[PDB]
Design a binder for this molecule. Structure first.
Ligand SMILES: CNc1nccc(-c2cccnc2Oc2ccc(NC(=O)Nc3cccc(C(F)(F)F)c3)cc2C)n1
Length: 240
């Protein structure tokens, strides 16, 4: 397939992102609704990520999972790069979280389940996802989470099995409304993650504390496998 900008009808802006604006779009060849990101060669060059982007897209093109935001393909012209992406009608988990302040245990477990299934898919094909932020987590029409990930969220080994640490930080944030190691200073945040200093408010149930505590280990090897997250009693009791 040899894509071009002529193949799409451009609709409303969906906001700014890292290295370009994202627009609602509709492909003339199929009438199908999607999202189009516009990037700039000069901006990608000035930083030095042009080679990292070309790799990410090649990997991203070969991933078919309902909990990963689909990259249908890509193209470029003289001065721009274009990503053809699945549109997520329900927005970000980030925005939802600040709207709702926090999530109950059914919403959290269901999300973690969805994440762990997407992270399992990627494991069975030797693809590794680093840190995962709520900003990179999008929502489809049926409310299902979709990963759009091509300090507070980084494990101790990346600042001094990364998937699992991310699952633990998110599970905490979803229920509590703030990341577990957040502090007023970058140095204080550093100390928290390195020493793994988190405390639960009174309302976090014991089953959730067991999962989070097993996920937030300093030693990467002592973190559970993704199957063990999916079979955890708290997860299966609360997931839809
Ligand atoms: C509302 N529904 C909806 N639906 C689909 C999209 C959006 C969307 C909207 C606004 C912004 N990003 C949006 O989606 C994204 C689109 C790509 C990316 N990833 C990305 O830009 N990665 C990226 C870039 C440069 C260099 C690099 C590199 F190579 F350096 F790592 C890696 C991440 C998001 C989150 N929104």
């Amino acid at each position: 397939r040899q894509w071009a900008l002529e193949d799409f009808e451009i609709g409303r802006p969906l906001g700014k992102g890292k290295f370009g604006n994202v627009y609602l779009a509709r492909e003339k060849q199929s009438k199908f609704i999607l999202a189009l990101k516009v990037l700039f060669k000069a901006q990608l060059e000035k930083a030095g990520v042009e080679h990292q982007l070309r790799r990410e897209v090649e990997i991203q093109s070969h991933l078919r999972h309902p909990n990963i935001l689909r990259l249908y393909g890509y193209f470029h012209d003289a001065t721009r790069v274009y990503l053809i992406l699945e549109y997520a009608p329900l927005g970000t988990v980030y925005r939802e979280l600040q709207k709702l302040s926090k999530f109950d245990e059914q919403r959290t477990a269901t999300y973690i389940t969805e994440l762990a299934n997407a992270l399992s898919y990627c494991h069975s094909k030797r693809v590794i996802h680093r840190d995962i932020k709520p900003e990179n987590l999008l929502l489809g029409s049926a409310g299902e989470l979709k990963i759009a990930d091509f300090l507070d969220y980084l494990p101790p080994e990346m600042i001094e099995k990364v998937d699992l640490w991310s699952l633990g930080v998110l599970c905490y944030e979803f229920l509590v409304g703030k990341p577990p190691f957040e502090a007023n200073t970058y140095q204080e945040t550093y100390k928290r993650i390195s020493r793994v200093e988190f405390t639960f408010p009174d309302f976090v149930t014991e089953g959730a504390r067991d999962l989070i505590s097993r996920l937030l280990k300093h030693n990467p090897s002592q973190r559970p496998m993704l199957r063990e997250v999916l079979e955890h009693p708290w997860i299966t009791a609360n997931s839809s």
